[PDB]
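Hey, sorry to bother you again with one of my protein questions. A protein chain has come my way and I'm curious about its shape. It would help a lot if you went through both lines with me. I owe you a coffee for this, so here goes:
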Amino acid sequence: AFTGKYEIESEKNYDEFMKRLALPSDAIDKARNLKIISEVKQDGQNFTWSQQYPGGHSITNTFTIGKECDIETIGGKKFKATVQMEGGKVVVNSPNYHHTAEIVDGKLVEVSTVGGVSYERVSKKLA
């Protein structure tokens, strides 16, 4: 039930996640809260997701419910994944990039996780 604009206003664990994720120090330090606008669109059961740092970099993805998709989150780490959806909550699972998203209380809740360290994150809606 995404289909809308979203703003991201907080994350939790950009030091432990990033240590393992593997970014150089300057990138880690600025990421602390380089703010991001997020947005999603859907056709029938084909989702089109989009997170955008104002900076040149962006994390755009596109995937189907059920069936199968591929992800390339930060860079040089293409994955394969069988997105599924259960309740009003999408999940995705990858060799080393679990991810999920959720709608509750007219808000968008979201996570990313890597077999040990999690990176819960939350977002506002604006459409």
Notes: DSSP finds two helices and twelve strands in the chain. The radius of gyration is 14 Å. Helices lie at 16-21, 25-31.
